[PDB]
Amino acid sequence: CALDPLSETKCTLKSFTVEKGIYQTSNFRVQPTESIVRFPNITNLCPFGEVFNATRFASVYAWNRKRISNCVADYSVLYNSASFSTFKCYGVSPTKLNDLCFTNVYADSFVIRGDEVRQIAPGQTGKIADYNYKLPDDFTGCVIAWNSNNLDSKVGGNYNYLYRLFRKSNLKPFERDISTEIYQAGSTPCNGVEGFNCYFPLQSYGFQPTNGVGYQPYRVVVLSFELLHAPATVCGPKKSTNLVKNKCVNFNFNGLTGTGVLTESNKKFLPFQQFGRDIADTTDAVRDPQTLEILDITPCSFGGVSVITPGTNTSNQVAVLYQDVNCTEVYSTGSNVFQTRAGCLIGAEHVNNSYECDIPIGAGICASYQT
């Protein structure tokens, strides 16, 4: 059957002597060459420069919380950067963050020493965890810590940052305690002054360059990923591929997910409108999100092979008719390619002289076997 078009005709009719006529043997479908995905420009970038190298950081007890939303966050780019010494993501992988979407994310910027880096993690008990900042056990997020010895350590000593040595009760997860009330460790009530049983809860950090790496200051930013069963305000940047025209390709224009050959079009969309439609509720035009140009979508060419044969008693050569398909845009091509309204038939050579109709083709064109 697959040897040659005459053999395909023989197989379709299930005979060995096919008579003069036209026989639709199979369908010619043009497969998509490639796939293209286009998405709008990254706009309103998140202010991650602050959580990277802000001029100052808050103390761990009064940890600063920053709301990040309505922007595009490149968590993968954050992971690639080697400035961060510690990049722990207990909830989910850092690389999946770029693909994933969250309705809101918060950054917790605070300064703790290297030895206290462990205390900020699920499943961990410590003085910083108990009285300064606590993490939920089921919390999904990334803990980012990098060395801040040059920034937050001085020869005289950096005592600006404060941490709470003790408190009446352990701090709840994601609870910020800035209270300066003097702690009471005895039955005698505190009177707001230092006493034998009364000690100030906050303690000044000891930061010096000569101190060990664990004692050396570190700036820690904690990213919290939260879903409220609501559409995601912040998401990772979406991949964009260069647009290709006049080639049947798979296209994804902000979720159209269609297949067709794209063409520049003269129809004028309304500025808010994105993708057009025809009468029969089928997509017919789309606007490129990157550049506001309107692209028509005609589908990939298809038709019927429709072998043109004379009687096998007379000849063994045939002509292949590719209906509604022009061969230039797309038996192998290059052998007396003739194009008519019904299609672009292959294997028969056009003649201006007109005779009686023998094999119908379409639009007044009739094929025949003649010298």
Epitope: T86, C89, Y90, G91, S93, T95, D115
Partner: antibody, heavy 120, light 106 residues
């Protein structure tokens, strides 16, 4: 309970390729990475690399780059590590490890049963 | 990269005595040192993941001490189950390097 099951007693011929399996159960596979550790009696224990499930990010130790290929299957929660061009030096026991966090640093809170690879 | 060196490979200790296992660090890794125990034909088990905080399940006998570049794994009383292979691991940064191992014996 968290379990990381490995077949063990692997037997291969030099120059071939082996696909060591680390079956995991009792814990969510997607929320954590996967690490492999090689154990030679004369070289002790050495970390091989890290693979992120449902991700294309792969990191190999410089010594074991190319020698070991990390593969992950989301279905059935199985982790694979392919060793190509096996020599006599590759004859060792390989441990799959469950990281405490999907990232770095990590201290390998949990470990697998281990496959004893022999190259003969 | 950072290398872990356990100086002594095979060492002897009597049952019920207090013993200390030494691990050396080439660079100041703060307190990021982990210890594991491996019985023959058994998977390694985490004992003390940072410098002093013991893993879940492990007895109070194992106590991790040390800071800076010197780190020590101490066992208050040596049991028959404690006669195994022990490793020290640094988690300061990637790549990850373990110790040379140390086996307890009578």
């Amino acid at each position: 309970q968290v379990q990381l099951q490995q077949p063990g007693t692997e037997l291969v011929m030099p120059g071939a390729s082996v696909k060591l399996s680390c079956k995991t159960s009792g814990y969510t596979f997607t929320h954590y990475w996967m690490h492999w550790v090689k154990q030679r009696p004369g070289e002790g224990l050495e970390w091989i690399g890290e693979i992120a499930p449902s991700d294309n990010y792969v990191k190999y130790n410089q010594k074991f780059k190319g020698k070991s290929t990390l593969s992950v299957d989301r279905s059935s929660s199985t982790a694979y590590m392919q060793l190509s061009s096996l020599t006599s030096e590759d004859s060792a026991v390989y441990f799959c490890a469950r990281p405490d966090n999907s990232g770095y640093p990590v201290y390998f809170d949990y470990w697998g049963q281990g496959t004893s690879l022999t190259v003969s | 990269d950072i290398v872990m060196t356990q100086s002594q490979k095979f060492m002897s200790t009597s049952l019920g005595d207090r013993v200390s296992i030494s691990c050396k660090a080439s660079q100041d890794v703060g307190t990021t040192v982990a210890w594991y125990q491996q019985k023959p034909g058994q998977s390694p088990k985490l004992l003390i993941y940072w410098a002093s905080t013991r893993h879940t399940g492990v007895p109070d006998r194992f106590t991790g001490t040390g800071s800076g570049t010197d780190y020590t794994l101490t066992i208050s009383s040596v049991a028959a189950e404690d006669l195994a292979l022990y490793y020290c691991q640094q988690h300061y940064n990637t790549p990850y390097t373990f110790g040379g191992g140390t086996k307890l014996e009578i």
